[PDB]
Design a protein around this nucleic acid. Structure first.
Lengths: 92, 78, 66, 94, 104, 78, 89, 103
DNA sequence: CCTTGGCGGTTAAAACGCGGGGGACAGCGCGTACGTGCGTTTAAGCGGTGCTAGAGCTGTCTACGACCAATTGAGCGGCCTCGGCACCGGGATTCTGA
DNA sequence: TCAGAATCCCGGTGCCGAGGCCGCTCAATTGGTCGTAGACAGCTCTAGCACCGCTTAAACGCACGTACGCGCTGTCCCCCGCGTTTTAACCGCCAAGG
């Protein structure tokens, strides 16, 4: 039975920042775990924020607040910048 | 410089509660910095929660949530 | 209170506080410092000293994970 | 010919901080787990489960010995002693 | 017709994230921008870590990325270490570190 | 008595990786007990998950969840 | 609303001639809320690994067994079982 | 009649039912879950209050105070393990002095 | 599907003895850092009086997401493919120790 | 100095694991309907913030002594490095049946 993964996407990301570089299967598994863990952390924080203000809808504002709470230092700044750039391009 | 408001005998008092007999002369300057870092972290998270909540007043529940985020649950101010 | 206001001015200008919001901060800070000293005293005793030293404080924070 | 006491100790430190292999032997570790898992009688195990238990255990032991070494150095000693482990596990919160 | 990922200019799939949010018991409703934002963040983190992994590989004269390289890439960066300070990586080893008092 | 199977060379090698230069003759009985306690906790949690799942075989995902419960978060096994 | 009157009702059964302050009442309120959140969250986790829609008494019992210590969990399970038996019988 | 009266409990089953159905935990809830959880909460509450009342009687008092709660929780082997990461306001610490400091 | 179980051979590994250097330990004289004590000064809390920023509680309504049908192409998989890398070997270079 | 034990270096062998290509589920996109969530408009008022006189709780400078932090010495407890002996960790082929 088929199962979801992130391997092709991770490989596509890798082929952009290092045009000549391979990645082992164990590393791909570690990357899958990392993506899943960060996804769970951000989603859980966002769902927790959505309940303090009694909101039915989780929006990009809540997601941004969760990312800002969760990432330290300039990494959060760059994450917010990238997310805002993508959301801005999505609407147009 | 309001960090000097946390007095030498106040820090001695905290050490007495902690069970310390004899205090060196630099413990005070170390403790001031430790407290400053801890308070900066907690206040940062609390103000973040407030700015998300669109409030200008900083509630006590925001402080409680920030402490829960740090991992120090506080009973009494709920 | 003055210290908290001063260090909060760095994140958002023109804020306002609740009394319980400051009381909780004080409680947490006192508990944290008491725990830190409780561990530091054990460090100093393990060092076969009575007097308590900043190297003991730093060791306590390092082993605790701060 | 003899290398002076401590020299080969440093050599081993270097080589074992360079390598990434497992240090504990699989068959004894397996027998230990299947002995102390007797909770529920007549159990069965996936191999990856024991493979993960060994990784977690060796990571935990290394992380404990690092703080043990820190305590021993703080005590102005080279030799680690069980009181150092006890202090480490007391400050760690166990 | 174009995919939402193509419409947003990202490499991670928007739609799968959307489904995982709506099938994860987080809230009653999910906003239409949330998955785009989250995918952008995840793609940025992926690229950030892979850049250091590839640098570690080039430093160790290798073509493939291995868990040892991931361990070095994570533990040699301060922000990533703080973000993953409670994560154990299999077959990742440790960092070379000898105290200055143990050696003459 | 399989706890004696964690041999003195094995513990020495682990200490060498930890950065220890000189090892006391009493470290091993302590290390064995600590390892036994840790394994007992993790295996107890894993067996609990298994018994809830109605399975004879203890899976690796059960071990991963048991470690996540205690705050270890092992990567590489799904 | 809170659990104050119910805490009073519990207190008057184990210590008849005693009182309790409002600060202690608030602390007990926080304690009840915290344990409720912990158990509910653990059960919600358990219900997802097996891909089931419904949180059942079995799920709550599993969460209790995972969360409480040894001697406490046995009595907790016994009390819950007795109550859920009396609920139907 | 109230479900609590059927179950023989003291904590309200119905409010627990509502909170489970309201707090976004799952798609469905079985009828026995709130009764079970209420029994557990009642038992824990009764244990805490019993030890608090003992600590209060030990000091010639008739009103339970946060210091009494602190002593009751910290003077127990398992409750300390359950509430190890919890700070109680106006609670204080346990009196103890290390044996290498007394003359 | 794959876990537990079995017989068998190879040799990496753990345990046992020994020499003797490393450092753990008790003990001593010494210097001054921190204490007990104590006058003078700062400004921490009280309470009283007052203003109002901003939290809080009523009403709109349309922007937004959930849900539904139909279409179809993106992602997981199976199967060959082939080269990055470990392994093994001969040799020169580093480094330690007396 | 200089023996001699570790380690790095250049080179050949060949394999197994990282990958391309081809198939085809299922799940992602678009068009469209509908209910209502919550952004917005509006009215209400209470803890927080500010100023002031006041009592006095408390911090701090200074005096001065002995507790105790520290450098140094002698010595013997034990741990490392190496050699010898015993053995089970590991790899391989094979089977029942959970």
């Amino acid at each position: 039975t088929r199962k979801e993964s992130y391997a092709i996407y991770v490989y596509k990301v890798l082929k952009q920042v290092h045009p000549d570089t391979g990645i082992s299967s164990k590393a791909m598994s570690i990357m899958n775990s990392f993506v899943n863990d960060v996804f769970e952390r951000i989603a859980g924080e966002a769902s927790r924020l959505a309940h303090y203000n009694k909101r039915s809808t989780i929006t990009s504002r809540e997601i941004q607040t969760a990312v800002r709470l969760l990432l330290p230092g300039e990494l959060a700044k760059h994450a917010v910048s990238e997310g805002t750039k993508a959301v801005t391009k999505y609407t147009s | 410089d309001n960090i000097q408001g946390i007095t030498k005998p106040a820090i001695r008092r905290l050490a007495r509660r902690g069970g310390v007999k004899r205090i060196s002369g630099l413990i005070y300057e170390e403790t001031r910095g430790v407290l400053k870092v801890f308070l900066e972290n907690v206040i940062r998270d609390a103000v973040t929660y407030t700015e998300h909540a669109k409030r200008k007043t900083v509630t006590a529940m925001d402080v409680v949530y920030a402490l829960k985020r740090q991992g120090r649950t506080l009973y009494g101010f709920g | 209170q003055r210290l908290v206001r001063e260090i909060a001015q760095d994140f958002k200008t023109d804020l306002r506080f609740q009394s319980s919001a400051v009381m909780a901060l004080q409680e947490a800070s006192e508990a944290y410092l008491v725990a830190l000293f409780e561990d530091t005293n054990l460090c100093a005793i393990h060092a076969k000293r009575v007097t308590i030293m900043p190297k003991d404080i730093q060791l306590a924070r390092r082993i605790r994970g701060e | 010919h003899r290398y002076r006491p401590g020299t080969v100790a440093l050599r081993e430190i270097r080589r074992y901080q360079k390598s990434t292999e497992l240090l504990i032997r699989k068959l004894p570790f397996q027998r230990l787990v299947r002995e102390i898992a007797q909770f529920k009688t007549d159990l069965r195990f996936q191999s990856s489960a024991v493979m993960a238990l060994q990784e977690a255990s060796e990571a935990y032991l290394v992380a404990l010995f690092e703080d043990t070494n820190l305590c021993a150095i703080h005590a102005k000693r080279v030799t680690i002693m069980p009181k150092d482990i006890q202090l480490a596990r007391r400050i760690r919160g166990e | 017709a174009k995919t939402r990922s193509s419409r947003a200019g990202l490499q991670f799939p928007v739609g799968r994230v959307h489904r995982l949010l709506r099938k994860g018991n987080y809230a009653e409703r999910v906003g239409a921008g949330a998955p785009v934002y989250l995918a952008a963040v995840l793609e940025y983190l992926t690229a950030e870590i892979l850049e250091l992994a590839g640098n570690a590989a080039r430093d160790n004269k290798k073509t493939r990325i291995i868990p040892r390289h991931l361990q070095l890439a994570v533990r040699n960066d301060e922000e990533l270490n703080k973000l993953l300070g409670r994560v154990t990586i299999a077959q990742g080893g440790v960092l070379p570190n000898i105290q200055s008092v143990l050696l003459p």
